[PDB]
Design an enzyme around this catalytic site. Structure first.
Site, PDB file in Angstrom:
ATOM      1  CG  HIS A 154      -2.404   0.667   1.024  1.00 13.19           C
ATOM      2  ND1 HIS A 154      -2.467   2.122   0.636  1.00 13.19           N
ATOM      3  CD2 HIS A 154      -3.418   0.007   0.802  1.00 13.19           C
ATOM      4  CE1 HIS A 154      -3.640   2.115   0.269  1.00 13.19           C
ATOM      5  NE2 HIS A 154      -4.191   1.061   0.548  1.00 13.19           N
TER       6      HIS A 154
ATOM      7  CD  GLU B 259      10.963   2.617 -13.336  1.00 12.91           C
ATOM      8  OE1 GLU B 259      10.758   3.736 -12.781  1.00 12.91           O
ATOM      9  OE2 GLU B 259      11.687   1.682 -12.722  1.00 12.91           O
TER      10      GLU B 259
ATOM     11  NE  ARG C 296      10.194   4.681  -6.465  1.00 13.12           N
ATOM     12  CZ  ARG C 296      10.623   3.354  -6.719  1.00 13.12           C
ATOM     13  NH1 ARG C 296      12.048   3.229  -6.900  1.00 13.12           N
ATOM     14  NH2 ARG C 296       9.743   2.523  -6.982  1.00 13.12           N
TER      15      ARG C 296
ATOM     16  CG  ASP D  81       6.981   3.557 -12.466  1.00 14.55           C
ATOM     17  OD1 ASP D  81       7.411   4.002 -11.333  1.00 14.55           O
ATOM     18  OD2 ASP D  81       6.776   2.108 -12.571  1.00 14.55           O
TER      19      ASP D  81
ATOM     20  NE  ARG E 218       1.468   2.673  -7.314  1.00 15.06           N
ATOM     21  CZ  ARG E 218       0.548   2.173  -6.500  1.00 15.06           C
ATOM     22  NH1 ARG E 218       0.734   0.972  -6.326  1.00 15.06           N
ATOM     23  NH2 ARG E 218      -0.337   2.949  -6.269  1.00 15.06           N
TER      24      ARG E 218
ATOM     25  NE  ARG F  36      10.083  -2.325  -7.978  1.00 20.77           N
ATOM     26  CZ  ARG F  36       9.393  -1.305  -8.235  1.00 20.77           C
ATOM     27  NH1 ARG F  36       9.237  -1.013  -9.504  1.00 20.77           N
ATOM     28  NH2 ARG F  36       9.138  -0.206  -7.191  1.00 20.77           N
TER      29      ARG F  36
HETATM   30 CL   LIG Z   1       6.478   2.585  -7.726  1.00 21.29          CL
END
Ligand SMILES: [Cl-]
Lengths: 932, 139
Positions: free
Chosen positions: A168, A549, A756, A586, A624, A439
């Protein structure tokens, strides 16, 4: 005590009509709010309850007409509160909003579907009220696509949906509160049973108040093991029981089109993966020990659930007629030393052979649990590994023997009961429930190989060109000499990487999935992970998954993957399967959303072309945020929107933590989630979306140029943008605040480029502004409308006939539904310098223009014109969220500016402003859920 | 024990120290924790066989066919280098596996138990360097 009549009036004014005739949302939320406000009066006094209700009423009037006077009316009350009253009010609106979510879930789960509301095209797949269930999808495949039932069944046989649980971005909700929400939903639903007795209804009311109070009266940034424990709760809540029910429904739908088989119980239609304890990308707190811990913890939870499920299985398996093979194994097992069923039977006799064999399985499950626990809490055991199940075949073999024997004896129906469900649970969940992905950034692998080559006096792998790196890595993978030993200068980071590899090496392969390379750009990154894996003595290396990304990285991805497939070593390691990951949030942080969407469609196209070229089965892993990050019905069309052949019976999707409760919290919601993922994968494999017309691709290419231009010109070129971002938004407080389990800036010094994606989206989502989601769409649509008069008509054609485009626009419209420029203007007025105040005015004008243009493209006059149910539920939440917004804004001004003294009001009851800020962040986060 | 001896001499009790205590100290120094130190003895030819399986496995040639000077030069280049020599991926005959396993057992036991590694039929420096390298690369 007539307050209920007023809150009833305000709720009816907020949501006037009925989106159906089982529309009990206003009733539900009125009930929850009455009971909550009575409890609040009882715990913190009459004065507190009156203040709170005045705040909510003003909030509903604002979400009614958006009068700016209402916002200052809220602020005058909220600033005069000493920190105690601020905390009690913020806590109160958090739980009120949570109750609105729970009522909303009950409405969704028990809303009756409407057959006459289907239009017959792909738009139906954007809402749970009109989407195709499993059997409607079957009849769509059989009638319209002229596919045979045999073809559908074989497709299902070879299909896999792999759902990946990620951490989360904020409050990973504790397991206890999940249980409490469950009891509240159950009490609501049963209170509206059209048959309930007077006493049952009274006792249900008393249980409802009791539960609301239980949730309201409970107050480190939880260790990754604790967050993982919390993230796994959905298996106990609904998924464990839910999976075999769904697979059984698949069997029924197959029987109803003439297929007499059931889906083979070992067919992995559903799989679960986890990042919890495996994602190290910019997170030094996720250590090798953390990964080992969550691996063993997962194996423990699994052994417990199998152990508890197998006793009722032992009670059912009381037959005596059996196979010759099963009888042999039963007489074999009878030759041994019976401690875990003395309460049931003194010992298992040989005339109940299934009970003998199953009892031995239960015993091995018990030893499996105790060993995993012993390794977790110490580091060694003494429980022989041969007395446990180490791989899925040791586990499945006796169960499959039981199934064979029962069918042999004409007892197939008995086998298709508790036993079939059990087999399907073993196949879905394995010995771990989840498979952990690991990762790490590629840069860390460059650092490790660089320390290695410098240690071998061969040069610095970092200075080497990409081709020289590839050639050296390939010469090492094809050679027989080891690379390094203990004699190796390791920095803290380099030692972390190698130790992570050693921990992966010392654990069962059933616990791991994919090794994910963040910031992947070139084949040398993938070969670096493969070599480091092999030289750390990992016997069965993980499949390596590059994460592309940035936008340029997306463009270069198909060349790099083709080059990887072309080298003989990697081609023999992958054995015809490759998983590639693309990141929507990203990439949006890099180049805006519209550009990332079109670039990800094209990139998936090209990756598919390569995959067909080299005979590799490609699996696209969707990270995500994005269009693939939504809740409920929209996801169905999302999946249907992917480019043709990008799925091909192997889907891997991130279930974002901000949606996971809406998706798996309730029995029905969970079943429908599994149903729509399976159905959309099956249909897409046999019925791809239309190929875009050439003018559509040219138009999107131009719009992509203009949109990235605007986005980078605002976010990256404007010199004073970073200062504005640090003022008009709680980004600084989010990072300093020990909220996000990891830190925000990858390198602490850097700008947004190093920021981020999660805090990037979050910071602007908190202010109901959502700039990272919509910015760029405005100029792109303005440009094409002005360049040619007819382009609007083309745009409107795409929104009506191209699924990819429809889902992209639909997402922008939905995010605008959660936006309100007035609240953002309040943040500007309180927190931003006067030198910089006109800047927010310009961005807000862009907000309005973008909104109008999106409406024009979608053919709508109001937002969410096509989904009134969602509009209703979101409008409901907004009344609570607005109050947490005003509270957060004034609390921020009070934190940053100790020169802002307020005329405080006397303490209220209860018979630190940092805490209040955290409350508003968590609350607003929970009310807005997913954006981009 | 040495602490006891120091203390006793400190207190003018040196004669008492030169009784059962001195004998005990002298027994610890003579016999150590093992009484004896074990020498290991093996023919050099077996080390030629092991290094030969190693180089053939690395596609560099046969250490056995190599002249004595070439053997010395390769062994010296490996002793001065930082890269390991071989891994589990190594075809071992029963004899070659015996040699390596003996080295692994020496590696897993206290140094006080061992003395000298004795090379039977020794003729040239490459035999001594072969044992030193096999010792080091078996950790
Ligand atoms: Cl992320």
């Amino acid at each position: 005590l007539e307050k209920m009549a007023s809150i009833d009036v305000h709720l009816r004014q907020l949501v006037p009509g009925k989106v159906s005739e089982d529309d009990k949302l206003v009733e539900y939320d009125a009930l929850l709010l009455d009971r909550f406000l009575d409890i609040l009066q009882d715990l913190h006094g009459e004065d507190l309850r009156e203040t709170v209700q005045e705040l909510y009423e003003h909030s509903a009037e604002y979400e009614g007409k958006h009068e700016p006077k209402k916002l200052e009316e809220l602020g005058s009350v909220l600033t005069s509160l000493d920190p105690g009253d601020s905390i009690v009010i913020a806590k109160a609106f958090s739980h009120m909003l949570n109750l609105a979510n729970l009522a909303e879930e009950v409405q969704i789960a028990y809303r009756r579907r409407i057959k006459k509301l289907k239009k017959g095209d792909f738009v139906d797949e954007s809402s749970a009220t009109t989407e195709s269930d499993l059997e409607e999808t079957f009849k769509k495949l059989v009638g319209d696509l002229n596919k045979s039932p045999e073809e559908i069944f074989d497709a299902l046989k070879n299909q896999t949906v792999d759902l990946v649980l990620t951490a989360h971005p904020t409050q990973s909700v504790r397991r206890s509160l999940l249980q409490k929400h469950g009891r509240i939903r159950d009490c609501l639903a049963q209170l509206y049973a059209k048959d309930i007795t007077p006493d049952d209804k009274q006792e249900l009311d008393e249980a409802l108040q009791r539960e609301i109070q239980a949730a309201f009266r409970t107050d480190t940034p939880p260790t990754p093991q604790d967050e993982m424990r919390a993230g796994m709760s959905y298996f106990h809540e609904t998924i464990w029981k839910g999976v075999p029910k769904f697979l059984r429904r698949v069997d029924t739908a197959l029987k109803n089109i003439g297929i007499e088989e059931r889906v083979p119980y070992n067919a992995p239609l559903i799989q679960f993966s986890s990042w919890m304890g495996g994602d190290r990308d910019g997170n030094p707190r996720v250590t090798p020990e953390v990964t080992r811990d969550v691996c063993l913890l997962a194996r423990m939870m699994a052994a417990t659930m199998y152990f508890n499920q197998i006793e009722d299985l032992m009670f059912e398996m009381s037959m005596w007629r059996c196979n010759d093979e099963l009888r042999a194994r039963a007489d074999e097992v009878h030759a041994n030393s019976a401690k875990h069923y003395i309460e049931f039977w003194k010992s298992i006799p040989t005339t109940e052979p299934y009970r003998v064999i199953l009892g031995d399985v239960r015993d091995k499950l018990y030893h499996t649990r105790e060993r995993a626990h012993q390794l977790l809490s110490n580091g060694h055991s003494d429980v022989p590994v041969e007395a446990t199940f180490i791989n899925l075949e040791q586990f499945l073999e006796p169960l499959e023997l039981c199934y064979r024997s029962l069918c042999s004896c004409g007892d197939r129906p008995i086998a298709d009961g508790s036993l079939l469900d059990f087999l399907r649970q073993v196949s879905t969940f394995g010995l771990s429930l989840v498979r952990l992905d690991i990762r790490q950034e590629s840069d860390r692998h460059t650092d490790v190989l660089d320390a290695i080559t410098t240690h071998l006096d061969i040069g610095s792998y970092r200075e080497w060109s990409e081709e020289r790196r590839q050639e050296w890595l390939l010469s090492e993978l094809s050679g027989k000499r080891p690379l390094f030993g203990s004699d190796l200068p390791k920095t803290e980071e380099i030692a972390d990487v190698l130790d992570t590899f050693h921990v992966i090496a010392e654990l069962p392969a059933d616990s791991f999935g994919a090794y994910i390379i963040s910031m992947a750009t070139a084949p040398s990154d993938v070969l670096a992970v493969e070599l480091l894996q092999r030289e750390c003595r990992v016997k069965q290396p993980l499949r390596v998954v590059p994460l592309f990304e940035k936008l340029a990285d997306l463009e270069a991805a198909p060349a790099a993957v083709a080059r990887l497939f072309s080298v003989d070593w990697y081609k023999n390691r992958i054995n015809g399967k490759q998983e590639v990951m693309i990141g929507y949030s990203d990439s949006g942080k890099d180049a805006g959303r519209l550009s990332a969407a079109w670039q990800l469609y094209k990139a998936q196209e090209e990756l598919v072309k390569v995959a067909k070229e080299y005979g590799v089965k490609l699996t696209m892993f969707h990270g995500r945020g994005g269009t693939v990050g939504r809740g409920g019905g929209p996801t169905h069309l999302v999946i249907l929107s992917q480019p043709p052949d990008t799925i091909n019976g192997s889907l891997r999707v991130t279930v974002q933590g901000e949606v996971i409760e809406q998706s798996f919290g309730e029995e029905h919601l969970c079943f429908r989630t599994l149903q729509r993922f399976t159905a959309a994968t099956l249909e897409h494999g046999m019925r791809p979306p239309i190929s875009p017309k050439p003018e559509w691709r040219a138009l999107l290419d131009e719009m992509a140029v203009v949109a990235t231009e605007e986005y980078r010109s605002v976010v990256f070129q404007e010199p004073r943008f970073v200062e504005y971002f640090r003022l008009a938004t709680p980004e600084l407080e989010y990072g300093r605040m020990n909220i996000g389990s990891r830190p925000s800036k990858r390198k602490p010094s850097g700008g947004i480029e190093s920021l981020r994606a999660i805090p990037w989206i979050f910071a602007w989502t908190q202010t109901r502004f959502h700039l990272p989601v919509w910015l760029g769409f405005g100029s792109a649509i303005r440009h094409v409308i002005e360049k040619d008069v007819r382009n609007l008509h083309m745009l409107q054609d795409m929104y009506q006939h191209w699924p990819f485009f429809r889902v992209t626009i639909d997402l922008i419209e939905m995010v605008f539904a959660k936006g309100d420029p007035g609240i953002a203007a309040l943040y500007d007025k309180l927190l931003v310098s006067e030198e910089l105040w006109p800047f927010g005015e310009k961005l807000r004008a862009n907000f309005e223009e973008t909104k109008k243009l999106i409406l024009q493209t979608a053919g709508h006059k109001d937002l969410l014109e096509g989904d009134p149910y969602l509009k209703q539920r979101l409008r409901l939440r907004d009344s609570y969220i607005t109050t947490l917004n005003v509270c957060q804004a004034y609390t921020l001004k009070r934190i940053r500016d100790p020169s802002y003294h307020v005329t405080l009001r006397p303490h209220i009851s209860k018979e630190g402003l940092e805490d209040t800020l955290i409350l508003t962040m968590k609350g607003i986060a929970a009310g807005l859920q997913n954006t981009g």
